[PDB]
């Protein structure tokens with residue numbers, strides 16, 4: 001069983017997002033796929049279904065829903081959570097940092 | 111059979127290209143590969159042969175020639191046309207926009 | 221357009237199947253997957269959906285229905301029809317042999 | 331709660347193994363790789379390390395140990411447990427049959 | 441620089457072939473592809489070109505010619521020679537055994 | 551004999567790097583993965599191990615050390631050196647340019 005995350009701060013999460021995700025992921029409504037998929041409205045989505053994106057077999061078949069609890073374990077270590085993913089991200093060790101990024105992703109709605 | 115496209119406008123095509131392709135594709139002569147291949151001189155080329163580019167099995171084996179009529183069907187829905195492609199683009203569903211992009215691609219020569 | 225096939229003979233089809241497919245494909249009801257999927261009840265099926273089978277991206281995404289006319293084109297040259305397939309079969313180039321195999325596949329029902 | 335893994339019968343297990351697995355997997359000491367890896371001494375192994383076998387990225391990176399409890403969940407639905415696997419097996423859907431196969435696997439030691 | 445192999449014995453090589461390759465590879469003229477390609481007339485062939493076979497990217501692109509010197513190093517350890525191959529064979533440590541198998545492959549002509 | 555690797559100019563190397571590599575590869579300490587991995591401290595590394603990067607099977611299994619002499623051969627033609635790589639780079643075909651880039655890479659240390 002995992003610890004719950006501390007409350008996330010979306011402004012800190014945006015800063016972390018720009019530093020750690022933005023070169024592969026756009027975050028704006030209608031933004032383009034690139035190395036990775038656009039992430040607007042990611043939170044709560046069924047995995048492997050962003051419009052236009054061609055996923056690995058692992059991510060296509062992964063069958064999770066991206067709620068914050070699932071994002072927490074995934075973002076800690078993507079390879080461990082989803083072996084076979086083509087997302088080239090080692091992970092974020094710090095619980096507050098993961099909480100902040102998740103809180104930022106949560107604002108990508110409207 | 112396929113409905114013909116309307117006449118394309120290259121300037122609108124360029125605008126559409128920069129909004130919808132430019133983050134994966136360069137368009138200048140001798141431009142680099144990135145997410146996707148450089149597209150200078152694309153139109154009329156045998157598929158899966160751009161200098162330097164490491165294609166999916168599907169795109170390497172595809173055996174088409176990118177004439178305008180073929181580009182029409184492909185750009186409407188890449189996954190339907192070339193299942194197994196790693197091009198993360200859903201397609202352009204509006205005939206005029208598809209025609210405009212094709213008209214732009216046609217200018218990439220000299 | 222496609223030249224029609226001659227009428228197939230299922231008994232010749234079975235002989236051809238055992239010589240050219242049987243080492244990758246079972247044909248009995250509830251037969252197992254191996255190199256390739258079990259083919260009982262193949263004809264008329266949506267492509268890439270046989271119980272249990274782990275397909276290539278190309279075959280998973282292919283979106284055809286294996287009607288006889290589609291099987292004709294596919295079995296003549298699988299790589300041309302479905303570039304990116306992992307089916308290691310060059311094709312049957314003789315119309316009568318292709319028709320016979322199709323006639324055999326059509327018997328796999330009940 | 332997940333159903334407790336029932337006591338397995340190894341003789342029934344072998345019967346189930348030969349009907350559902352043997353076309354891809356050998357079970358004898360020093361038996362060959364084929365579609366899937368030789369499974370002698372599988373129980374207790376780190377995943378994705380059987381001598382000579384070229385795994386999918388998902389199975390190579392899976393990082394589990396094949397204890398009986400892990401096999402229970404995996405064998406029920408391989409695709410759910412290991413999305414991205416190339417193992418073409420839908421799963422042992424009946425819990426007693428699944429337990430019997432595990433009991434058979436457990437005997438492959440010496 | 442490698443040692444030359446000792447003279448190979450084709451009868452011993454056939455025995456080794458049946459024990460170590462035959463479940464993935466046929467050896468007869470006109471024999472079928474299976475897990476791996478038919479190997480009749482393999483010796484001296486450009487790599488990645490057997491009729492009908494769908495290779496990994498690595499083997500498709502490998503650009504070697506299968507002369508006995510190249511078969512020697514490859515068969516010792518396929519992964520080391522061709523990283524990314526999907527051939528699930530660890531290798532043969534013993535120079536006489538590799539020589540024998542190569543001498544057997546050399547007879548697959550006529 | 552293979553041409554000796556000429557003395558490289560690192561400033562010319564950086565210029566060549568920014569024109570030919572930077573769209574896929576960062577070069578700064580702690581820079582992000584993108585299309586390809588961050589290359590800080592690349593020289594002398596075991597291949598296929600840069601933190602966070604999800605490699606092709608060929609690059610993951612490559613088993614080389616990126617000394618300058620190995621980089622020379624690789625960078626001349628990546629596809630020839632590492633068949634199966636997903637690096638979309640045809641190669642540095644001019645030996646002085648190839649040496650300059652290596653000299654630049656050598657400076658990425660501290």
Ligand code: HEC
Pocket residue numbers: 016017020021023024025035036037042046047048049050054055056057058059060066075084085086087088089101582583584585
């Ligand atoms: C490029 C080097 C990336 C970095 C850095 C990050 N991500 Fe990523 N991501 C990337 C790819 C190529 C993919 C698809 C993976 C596949 O196996 O197909 C992803 C996927 C995600 C997902 C899942 C999307 C879905 O299921 O629809 C999420 C939620 C995601 N990525 C988020 C994410 C975050 C929060 C990152 C840093 C803080 C991050 N990614 C880094 C490519 C890259």
Ligand code: HEC
Pocket residue numbers: 032033034035126127130131133134135145146147152156157158159160164165166167168169170176185194195196197198199211
């Ligand atoms: C990144 C998310 C991409 C976007 C958006 C678009 N393209 Fe693309 N394209 C991309 C990749 C990775 C590839 C290779 C695909 C593979 O399976 O190997 C491609 C391929 C093409 C091709 C074919 C090139 C060839 O056969 O040589 C064409 C003609 C092409 N792409 C054009 C194109 C256009 C016109 C786009 C939007 C208007 C577009 N692409 C989007 C990556 C991405």
Ligand code: HEC
Pocket residue numbers: 236237240241243244245255256257262266267268269270274275276277278279280286295304305306307308309321472473474475
């Ligand atoms: C092994 C060397 C094979 C031989 C010979 C043949 N088939 Fe095959 N087939 C094989 C594989 C591995 C797959 C999956 C391909 C993938 O890319 O995922 C297939 C697929 C088919 C299909 C499609 C099934 C579906 O969409 O559900 C059909 C209809 C099919 N194969 C039929 C077929 C016939 C009639 C053959 C010879 C007469 C034949 N196959 C040869 C493996 C191999």
Ligand code: HEC
Pocket residue numbers: 252253254255346347350351353354355365366367369372376377378379380384385386388389390396405414415416417418419422431
């Ligand atoms: C062919 C159609 C298969 C059938 C039926 C079964 N297995 Fe399998 N298995 C197969 C492949 C190709 C692989 C490698 C998968 C990959 O993604 O690389 C596997 C893998 C396993 C493993 C894991 C081995 C390891 O981690 O070292 C186990 C434990 C395993 N298979 C067992 C198993 C059992 C018990 C089956 C039926 C009762 C079964 N497999 C079916 C190919 C096929």
Ligand code: HEC
Pocket residue numbers: 362363364365456457460461463464465475476477482486487488489490494495496497498499500506515524525526527528529541
């Ligand atoms: C299944 C478990 C295999 C065993 C055992 C052996 N081989 Fe194999 N081989 C296999 C596959 C799936 C492939 C294609 C690999 C790819 O990456 O695409 C191969 C390939 C070869 C080749 C190269 C063929 C070519 O380039 O055209 C050769 C020469 C070869 N295999 C020979 C060989 C020998 C001599 C073996 C044991 C003594 C052997 N293989 C074992 C599958 C399997």
Ligand code: HEC
Pocket residue numbers: 142143144145566567570571573574575585586587589592596597598599600604605606608609610616625634635636637638639642651
């Ligand atoms: C994108 C179009 C690229 C260009 C241009 C270049 N590289 Fe690259 N590189 C890229 C990818 C996607 C990968 C991973 C390849 C895989 O098969 O997994 C690489 C890999 C390298 C490596 C090896 C890294 C390692 O083993 O850890 C090196 C040393 C490397 N690339 C260097 C390099 C140089 C010097 C380039 C131009 C001068 C260059 N790359 C171009 C993507 C792309």
